[PDB]
Amino acid sequence: SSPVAQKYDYILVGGGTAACVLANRLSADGSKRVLVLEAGPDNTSRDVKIPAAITRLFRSPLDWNLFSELQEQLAERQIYMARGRLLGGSSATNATLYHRGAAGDYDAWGVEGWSSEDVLSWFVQAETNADFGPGAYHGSGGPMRVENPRYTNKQLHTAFFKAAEEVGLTPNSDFNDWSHDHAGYGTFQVMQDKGTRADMYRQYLKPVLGRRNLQVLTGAAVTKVNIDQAQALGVEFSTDGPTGERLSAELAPGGEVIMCAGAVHTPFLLKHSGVGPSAELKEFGIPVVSNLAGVGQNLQDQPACLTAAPVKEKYDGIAISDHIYNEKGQIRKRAIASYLLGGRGGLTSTGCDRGAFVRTAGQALPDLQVRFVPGMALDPDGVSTYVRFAKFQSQGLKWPSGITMQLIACRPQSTGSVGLKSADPFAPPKLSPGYLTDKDGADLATLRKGIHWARDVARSSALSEYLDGELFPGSGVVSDDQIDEYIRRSIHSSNAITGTCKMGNAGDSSSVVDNQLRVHGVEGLRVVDASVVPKIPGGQTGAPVVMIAERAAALLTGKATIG
Ligand SMILES: Cc1cc2nc3c(=O)[nH]c(=O)nc-3n(C[C@H](O)[C@H](O)[C@H](O)COP(=O)(O)OP(=O)(O)OC[C@H]3O[C@@H](n4cnc5c(N)ncnc54)[C@H](O)[C@@H]3O)c2cc1C
Structure with a gap:
């Protein structure tokens, strides 16, 4: 009722960190009808603007209120795992600290075209640092704001x-x-603008809300990705919730579906969408479109x-x-x-x-x-x-x-898992952080x-x-x-969560997407969020996401190539 006989060149599942970057870049010409479905509300709360009020977003309407499964190893507890629920996603609810990790974190990725020398100039291209002059490691014109606290x-x-x-x-x-x-x-430097939080909604999405080729709906929770038998062809969402209508947004010729639902809900949406391990999908009566055993595995959290x-x-x-x-x-x-x-x-x-x-x-x-x-x-x-x-x-x-x-x-050897607990696309996922x-x-x-x-x-x-x-x-x-x-x-979560749809060399049966962020065995399906991270870097994970989302965006529109 809002995508009505309209076709999109890019449908972006999620209105999060990596989504707010991608929409900006992808919508920047005029030839591309970009769509951005966000399950949460708009970014207009004063608790999001003020850094200290982050104590008010934990366990709040702006949070998914996700709890893990019983963890035997953790005194038989459920582990609360914060995740932002609004445009800008977790960049709106985070502790704003700015980290890249070490050069050795990206070289140990082993993937082609993403060594530390590959990723460095995307980090810097995205930065305006108030406290380091411009140089090889710090930028001055990029859309992010970074300062000392x-x-x-x-x-x-x-x-x-x-x-x-x-x-x-x-x-x-x-x-x-x-x-x-x-x-x-x-x-630690913080992602802030003279003490106001500079989430990715503020720095990226908001200044391009006037573009007519850019359509962003909130309240719009996607239920699956249409994959006619393999080639994705749209998403299915509801503007009201579990008790609402089951709308559909169509793709135009050669239009791609970008997953930006995070490292919790993207593998979740992928399994519902027919992409996952057959054994797990067969259990809920979900047809298997591509049988990648990597979806949902390798959950890393610090x-x-x-x-x-x-x-x-x-x-x-x-x-x-x-x-x-x-x-x-x-x-x-x-x-x-x-x-x-x-x-x-x-x-x-x-x-x-x-x-x-x-x-x-x-x-x-x-x-x-x-x-x-x-x-x-x-x-x-x-x-x-x-x-x-x-x-x-x-x-x-x-x-x-x-x-x-x-x-x-901060470089933990333990991994976790995200999975299906219900056929109801609106149920909390099966989430085991896997610490220790x-x-x-x-x-x-x-x-x-x-x-x-x-x-x-x-x-x-x-x-x-x-x-x-x-x-x-x-x-x-x-x-x-x-x-x-x-x-x-x-034991609690320092809130990172990476790796549930990892990238890797061709011939990696463990991987989900390749070094161009497209998932194996599907057409016009790609993932650009913290999921693809093959190995968490020593540090809070928000900045590496933005670099992943920038690199992905010039790659899409021809400005850079990988390998
Ligand atoms: C409390 C907390 C503190 C953190 N502190 C820091 C820190 O200090 N520094 C740092 O660098 N990193 C920090 N992080 C991590 C950083 O915020 C995240 O790693 C990063 O924002 C993840 O970005 P993303 O693009 O992967 O996903 P997200 O920003 O999580 O975006 C995913 C989006 O998908 C949406 N979505 C989910 N399901 C659906 C659906 N069915 N339909 C539509 N949309 C859907 C979600 O609502 C969300 O907006 C913190 C994380 C948290 C939770």
Whole structure:
């Protein structure tokens, strides 16, 4: 009723990060009728604009409220896995930190035409960095905005960097400079524009909403991809929900269907769409169009645990939580005024934007990312505490002052899986994050040795001056067996999720798409989102997505080639 006898050259399933890039590039001439179906609403919320209000998007209408299956290995828990639900997708709901990983992360991909020398100029082509002059590793004209965080906790960030130095770490002045080693302490840059969040809706989609060849519908949840027997021919969606009409959007001659539904819902939509392993599809009575055993496998996610600790009494009031809430739980009016008049203060802060990369056991690249936060966690599950901080507003209590150190296996060997649990295209997928299931216990050994490392740093003379003890895991967690058991019951997601539709050389029976992002054994079907990532890079995964979506877009329209 909105695609009415109209045909599209590109149908984009999803209105997310990679989608917001692609629409911009693909719609940029005038010869292409681009479509962009987003299940979520429009991007118009003030909680999305303000970095600190990310504590309000967890478990919110703007989130898919996805929970994993029972994880036997994780004290028989379901694991909440945040995912954005709106135009801009997860770039609207994320912690905004800007990472590329290391040059060695893309060379180990092994795929042709995507070595570190291949991907570097797409990273830089997409960037306007406020804090690095232009060079081989930093851009000045690209659509993304990147800056150093404009909040600084003068006492507790500097004691963190001293601590790190006291325990023998060396400073990294730029984690995205591939000409030195990835490891060390320092500040993470954030995807922000003078303290306002610069999601991919803001930086890409929004400035081209006036193009007449660009059609973007929200509320439009796609149910499958029409594949006449192989050649895709459209998608089927509903503008109302599970209780709505089953519309259809047609492709024009030589029109392609781009999957941008994320690493959770794209393999999900692929299995419903007849693309998956026959055995899993035969179980729900789904016909098999292409039998690729890679769909839904290889789910990679970076698992986190934390330690938290209160400061001494003499330092009550110097936490970022003291700069955001007052002693009665109301937002400080001064924090609001700095933010609006000047883009400064606690409200520009996703909190976890200072840290380190450490090698725990002399590995080739760092296995451990530390994120330091000068607020105190109140639950061992970091995400939970963030939700608790949102609900804490105006309750009447003082949030206690202290620091949190989050620890993350950033190059984790464990993999997961996404699958079908119901024939209902509107049901939550079968989702198993798979943490701590690698055969060598390597992920577990990183997080445990992260717990020893964070207590070392908390013991340094620079940090012990501020701290009074340790709340999590607590003084009763001393043995190695007690630390792994603390990790198992508290392990949360640092929210990455890659690899569920991986690319690889021709002759890879494990792969889903090829190095040109088109899935094997289907015509005019391609995937351009975090799914294709064959191997998660040491770092938050949003920037590599944009590079994947830019490269894909010039490739489509003739500006670049791969291999
Ligand atoms: C809480 C959180 C914090 C993060 N923090 C950081 C960080 O600090 N730095 C960083 O670099 N990365 C971060 N990430 C990761 C980064 O946000 C994601 O890796 C990236 O945005 C994924 O982009 P994408 O294009 O793969 O998918 P998404 O941005 O997830 O887009 C997929 C879209 O598909 C839509 N969709 C799903 N099903 C359907 C359907 N049936 N019909 C229509 N549309 C559908 C979804 O609503 C969504 O908008 C974070 C992730 C989260 C969740």
